[model samples]
Target: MTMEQFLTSLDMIRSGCAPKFKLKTEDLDRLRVGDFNFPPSQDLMCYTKCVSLMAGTVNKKGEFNAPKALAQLPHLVPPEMMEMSRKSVEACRDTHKQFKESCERVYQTAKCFSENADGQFMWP
Candidate 1:
């Protein structure tokens, strides 16, 4: 995907998935700033899974596939963001294993990526 398409897709995917879940606006705002302390509801957790699934970085089981994520990097991220993004993926590869439920697995993995990222990170 072109960088322009990638940028546009971020919002598109976010809005597309958002309305299906009962997400709190404040929680979403906190997530954008890397604050995940708000014990997410099932809907919020599933919202994270939906975003990751749309990004093609995680599987149905909410597993973070580092190689798949790396392969998608060129199309999904700008060059300036690529290295840090890849590093976050590698570092957070096993994060899903820390959670048992599907939604929690994806949410925690997304959290790990946010924490490990050397640059900005956000979730829809």
Candidate 2:
């Protein structure tokens, strides 16, 4: 996918999942930039899981499926972001081991990716 297409895909995923999770626009905007420090809420947490699930990067357990992510990258991201995305996947592969709840696990994995990415990172 081109960068423009990748961005549109992110928005498409967000549009699909946001209403189901009742995610507020305000909170959604923050999450787009990887700002995950908002007040804790089930809606926000599950929203993260929802996005990752749609991207096929996480399992129902909220585990970062590194193999799946690696396999899906060519379809999910543009070439420009592939290396950075892959490295972040490697860095956060075990993040789920630190969290028990499914939603929290996915949220932390997403957080780890944003932090470890070499350039800008955005999540639905």
Scored by lDDT, the top model is: 2
Per-residue alpha-carbon lDDT of candidate 2 for residues 57-87, written as tens digits (9 for 90 to 100): 9989888889999999998889999999999
Task: Give residue 100's error in model 1 in angstroms.
Answer: 1.9
Please report, in order, the local distance difference test score of every candidate based on alpha carbons: 0.82, 0.86
What is model 1's C-alpha RMSD?
1.9
Residues 7-107, candidate 1, lDDT per residue (tens digit)?
67677887978998887889888886678766889998898898888889888888888899999888677777788888888898888888888899999
Work out the TM-score per prediction.
0.88, 0.93
CA lDDT for candidate 2: 0.86
Cα RMSD of all models vs. native, in order, equals: 1.9, 1.2
lDDT for position 68 in model 2 = 93
Deviating ranges (above 4 Å) for candidate 1: 1-8
